[PDB]
Symmetry: D3
Subunit: 249 residues, 6 copies
């Protein structure tokens, strides 16, 4: 391999410069198969990669793992191999009551409740998505009959206390994060996820473009964790593939 | 008046929901006369306001003064009068060699080198402009034959040390800010101004829409003080008409 | 213009080394006319400047605008023209019950609830007024038969949330400022304003002298000319 | 499942109260096989879990993925299933010249160069391992003829800039981390890894025991990335299994 | 003197490489007298120092005063004199209800509620004790019939607001320390003392060994002020173990 | 006792509202004997306390130990017995080339390089002396024919690395403190000491008055001075209590 974790060489990407980067290694294939001549490339650790062709141009599909540290490796190592555009597709918990389960979120920027983003810029720097790629995501959403929620996402290094979940072993949240959900609600923050703060900060600062679209799987104003009663439309995966086509055409 | 500083009452605004907010009280009239039926509203301290109409729609034009603290008062008091959309038009120093004096920057989001932003959200919160309004600014640039630089802006509470100007009385920059310009350059930050970090944070947290377009009057890879020597204001008025259509 | 924002040259100051720096451009003329031979210098943006003469010596009167950022420009650019002493005058809202409307506050140092101070020193550095000029303000107070409240002022980048006002469109105060007025009250802080943290920190760290006097117009728990006559008296004291 | 990510129920753990938690899902099976009746439980995302028995006592082996956010989910979820003891096993880069490739480090505490620890305790709290489990890990190294390095570890949310690697696409490290390796070096910090600060802080604060043994795969005073010239003793996985047995006996 | 505050020369230490460092200058002599040939060395400011012998080997016993800043001077100056190992012995207030007055706490690491620690490393660095010396302390406890409580200690620059005492002139704690005791309790923190964050951070960063044992003189789940030692016997036993 | 560390009761102070607070226990008696009817009160740990009379008004002289933490205990326990004014006296190293050995400093406010100040107010609060006590100190200087340097002091929790000293075992200064003396020097800071941040902040926030005078005995850039600064502080006490 040309890179230390992903098991990939430059040749294996066949010139791809755009990556679709889901969180879950098990989603990779399905995303890939929405495009042409999808091919398995590698699987190492949380990093499963496929190659596919979007209207004839190579796209790499590579999972990140949960959270900013595994994301950071993925994004660096793909860029080492010539990727300069990273489209994240993900799942997310809504924190606003009007954002329904099954709705899609396009994140313009993120609250940096992570540590990896600080390793690319001080906290003063905005974890902001690339304008053209965000535009492409919005457009793919609307083309699909869906108006996305567009706004700010709370991007937390944890799933439990940092997203102010109480149904845990201790049922306690450290002071900084106690009441924090309300803080972000009040500020109009749409949702919680775990990677976009790192992805956006690292891409804005290193000269790469990123965007993120995500499907809402739970509304935190009603459940901490979704279950079988949770509402079971258009898919964030289809949208991202459509967005990638826009950007490569 | 029904607000504390601006000298305005709601009826004065004729239903305006959108403000164009330059820093310079003297730009207010000149923005306003690009529009129709320019009407003086009030002038107190650094806050001169005009009502004018953009293709039949009322728009307030209200200066902010230099910097976030005075901006925060104007944005708040306007919003108390029904303003929910704030378009900043400003001047700026570029810090990338590829950005020319005369060019326009549309700021997607801002590095928070201000303090007023912290009175609306802790630092982790992004100082991000509204997507729809930024889209409008970009379209207004392009409808005018201008390709804007669209990126991040360093928004500083000072013009001198925080923008790492050395041509001062003491010629020193405190440690945090020494080497800072290069830091932001390396990060692909386009430019320096003084208001957008506050403007964006307070609008994003308070449920209002903001965007900012600015004319590049100095390139900091060349010199500190801008040469005395429009495009930006015509773009903002163009964008206001897009948003109010 | 020798200087980019104020539209002043050094020659226009006639060697003035002391400035009175109110916040409001519209109050500069009237301050200036308390001294001799007041003359209009320039008006750009929020910066209106006058020259006048106190007991024969020139004194510049220049408005700062509201808040540290605009103040930091005025101060730096006046200093480039040879100013080395800056006397702030203004109004304020008190937060202690024993500080009545019609009193005078002399700020000895400020809680740094601003950003611009940090562009001159890290937060550990105290936002402290100059001893000599503070002393002159006190003395001018007492000459006018006013025993001033001498203490700490909370110097905020905002008028609204940073001063824990809830009479706003959203009625929300961010967490860090929720309960903050009471925090400052308990610590004996006298009042809120919006420029002294910046002014003080920048003058202390750059070698200039600063002090600040303000008339209490309102008390958050429950004169204008007085504050101006005192600052003019203080200027004379310092230039004598 | 009774936890949201791991796909596990409490019954699947056969009363296990201790987990060994490597980072790589592909290493779980292997570690499980140094114990008895190795039994696959689940595999979801980067989280592969096995049950095995260590001199008769049940032990869960579960991958964390890279970094503290993924680790934090596994640790919380295991603990909801009754685990109260977490033994990290992993690889590390040494930052002292006398810490050799092949050596093992038992971390007593970590420099918190992470975000996830702060969702458990403010930065003043020490990211300290449990004394008893640290002692057993030392004892298990010595039992095997290995004298471990015992000291402080730099625990970084990133592999690249936060570990002051410069062989990257931009070759730049943000101000805060430029020169940081020498700061940790000078302080006698032994090594870099990417999970222990989160693990330790989250366990110390929630009432669980944790410890970490790791093998040194590169010395950063000589190479950023190990390659085929790099040296390649008793394994860190052997030690951890040995520690587990001690602790459960 | 060879150093700026302690009034000590390197010769006076007779090759001692290990110090016992109590907080209280008046405990110094009592500790020294549990060893052989105890000899007053010096007394300046809060720094009272003795020499004594543990199974033939010299040990310096030198007080620190209360708090990190005076501790930082003493540890630095002793180390200038060849000391590489610093065993703190002290008093403390327990914040967990299962810890009794008269019990002993061995601090593995400390919450850095101090400022001097920052002068050796940024806050991210753990205020962690030396493994070997802690081991010695635990072992000394157990040989004495005392099971020590081993864990995390809140190491505070103040006795009053920083340990969230309210029985004070103003009866107020600044926001950051309001609720803080409950915070640390919830995180399993055992106790409050005033020196260990600084001692541990400075030793760990500068290549010296340190450990701390303390007698529990109050339980804060019951009251603020202690009612009017075995910790000293234990630390002397630990020094013996380390020197043997 | 009333108070746990100092071993004092209120009665013992004979109504004293003002303490002189030097660092060294050994120095208390001698400072007390510049006043009348010096009277031993107590001695525990590094806290030696004396009562004496300053032009017929009761004054406590109480040592603090080195540094903020031990000072915070003394000032709190004294305040619990009615003391509302605290005058710090001591020696210091100057960092400005214009401040000569034997000069006197009156600290108007301090750089907070200390942790205890944070246990009273967040860092944005200034570590400022009381104006009236500062004025008294300045007057006492001038009555003794001394013009004091009046400005900002860097108040450090360490003697060595926080004062950017490299004459240490390791010879190392952590990054934050690397180049820090030059930093303070450029800002006009006069000197380093180790207590005034703490004393100033706790006093300002708790409603008590404080000030600090120090005799310059070393200058980083280059007995009798000690005595001068002690005479000045006794003189200021007299002025304040008049
Ligand atoms: O609530 C949720 C759902 C998905 N991902 C998250 O980080 N949080
Ligand atoms: O350089 C410049 C020009 C205008 N405004 C700024 O903030 N900076
Ligand atoms: O409660 C107590 C007792 C002694 N030492 C402390 O720091 N706290």
């Amino acid at each position: 391999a040309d890179v230390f974790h992903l098991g990939l060489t430059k040749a294996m990407l066949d010139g791809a410069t755009l990556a679709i980067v889901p969180g879950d290694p098990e989603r990779v294939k399905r995303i890939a198969e929405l495009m042409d001549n999808a091919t398995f490339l590698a699987s190492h650790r949380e990093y499963t990669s496929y190659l596919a062709y979007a209207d004839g141009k190579p796209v790499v599909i590579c999972s990140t793992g949960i959270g900013g540290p595994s994301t950071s490796i993925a994004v660096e190592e793909l860029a080492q191999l010539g990727v300069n555009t990273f489209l994240r597709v993900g799942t997310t918990g809504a924190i606003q009551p009007h954002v329904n389960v099954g709705d899609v979120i396009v994140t313009q920027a993120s609250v940096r409740l992570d540590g990896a983003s600080l390793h690319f810029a001080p906290m003063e720097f905005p974890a902001v998505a690339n304008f053209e790629c965000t535009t492409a995501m919005v457009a793919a959403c609307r083309d699909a009959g869906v108006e996305p929620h567009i706004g700010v996402t709370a991007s937390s290094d944890t799933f439990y206390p940092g997203q102010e979940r109480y149904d845990t072993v201790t049922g306690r949240v450290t002071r900084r994060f106690a009441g924090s959900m309300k803080e972000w609600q009040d500020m109009g923050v749409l949702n919680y996820e775990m990677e976009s703060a790192t992805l956006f900060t690292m891409c804005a600062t290193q000269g790469w473009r990123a965007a993120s679209v995500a499907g809402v799987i739970v509304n935190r104003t009603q459940q901490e964790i979704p279950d079988e009663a949770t509402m079971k439309e258009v898919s964030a995966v289809s949208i991202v593939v459509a967005a990638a086509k826009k950007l490569l055409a």
